[PDB]
């Protein structure tokens, strides 16, 4: 998968350029979102482009969260979806991230949830992942996209915040469809997918 | 109807205490939300309390917006629901307001929409109206409430923002139910209701 667009506030830029461990959490997020491949036998992520809204997006989020959890030791649910916690220079630091699979109103609620966590000092950096419009077009109906929330990234200024817009590497009607729903893929299937991603 | 809870940022407080015409727009909003009465023959607002979620809320919003429009010369749709525009000391000033009838995610999107309008200088003050939890309990299923959005009022600090939580004056199972939906009441019915509210 590719990171095609990215928005980083000035405060996140300063924080990344001076905090190694925060820079690391961010690197792990970028890697977990670039790593998905499809089909599982492949080394690129190709999305089936037969019709609008034909693919699910939840399986992608589950895969992403699983890599962070299993490979990178991130925790799930703080109610921030996933976060990394660690001591650095005698201080506990937390990074929070959410992968948006809901509609635009959902994305607003998610952004504000992180913004409040930041204001209260519960997290030191917030990251949101969203598919860009081009990809979202072939993803399930509900799902919002990076460009739709973009006019509002400005509301995070003054706080360490990063928005990442991902895209598939290719679009073809010759690969299978990604299943829809929370149960689109079992944990056994996500873990098998994760292994292929990691060559195991 | 009663204004039972209210949140005003420090910046709204300063602005109200030094800008007469903004103070006036605010007074007109408070009056339009206190004015609803039910049934139409009554002088208080009594809400039917037979079951949870039995009453509609959209008719109340339509009535409120109609008083502001017809009696107070506010405009509808700028896409801020209603706003008042006026020249004061050789400057164009705008006040924007939204009456929340959607769910909590909706309320977040609405708050952010106003927050961005404020940052860009498109409006000078933002106001949001929401029913308090006690009332919301007897309102339609979708509708969010003041207390649910409350933890987030803090995100508006630094900007002129006001949140108003309204309540019915009485709860009784002997009055009729307020119809649900956008078409719950025709414009003829809302205007007839408005006249009773205004004694005409």
Swiss-Prot record, chains A, B:
InterPro entries per the UniProt record, alphabetical: BamHI/BglII/BstY, Restrct_endonuc-II-like, Restrct_endonuc_II_BamHI
Domain of life: Bacteria
GO biological process terms, semicolon-separated: DNA restriction-modification system
Active site (catalytic residues): 100 (proton acceptor)
UniProt-annotated binding residues for Mg(2+) 1: 81, 98-99
EC class (word): hydrolase
Cofactor note: Binds 2 magnesium ions per subunit.
Keyword Transit peptide recorded: no
Reactions it catalyzes: Endonucleolytic cleavage of DNA to give specific double-stranded fragments with terminal 5'-phosphates
GO function term, MF aspect, one: DNA binding
Record keywords, A-Z: Endonuclease, Hydrolase, Magnesium, Metal-binding, Nuclease, Restriction system
EC number: 3.1.21.4
Cofactor(s) this protein requires: Mg(2+)
Binding site for Mg(2+) 2: 77, 81
Listed CDD domains: BamHI-like (cd00942)
Subunit structure: Homodimer.
Note, other: The protein sequnce was determined following expression in E.coli.
Annotated protein name in UniProt: Type II restriction enzyme BamHI
């Amino acid at each position: 998968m590719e990171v095609e667009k990215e928005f980083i506030t000035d405060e996140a830029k300063e924080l990344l350029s001076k905090d190694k461990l925060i820079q690391q959490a961010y690197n792990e997020v970028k890697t977990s979102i670039c790593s998905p491949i499809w089909p599982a036998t492949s080394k690129t992520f190709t999305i089936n482009n037969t019709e609008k809204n034909c693919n699910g997006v939840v399986p992608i989020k589950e895969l992403c969260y699983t890599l962070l959890e299993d490979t990178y030791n991130w925790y799930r649910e703080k109610p921030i979806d996933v976060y990394k916690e660690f001591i650095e220079n005698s201080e506990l630091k937390r990074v929070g991230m959410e992968f948006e699979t809901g509609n635009i109103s959902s994305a607003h609620r998610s952004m504000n949830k992180l913004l409040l966590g930041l204001k209260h000092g519960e997290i030191d950096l917030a990251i949101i992942l969203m598919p860009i419009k081009q990809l979202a077009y072939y993803l399930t109906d509900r799902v919002t996209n990076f460009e739709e929330l973009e006019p509002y990234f400005e509301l995070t200024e003054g706080q360490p915040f990063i928005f990442i817009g991902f895209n598939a590497e290719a679009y073809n009607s010759n690969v299978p469809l990604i299943p829809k729903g929370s149960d689109g893929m079992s944990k056994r299937s996500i873990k098998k997918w994760k292994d292929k991603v990691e060559n195991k």
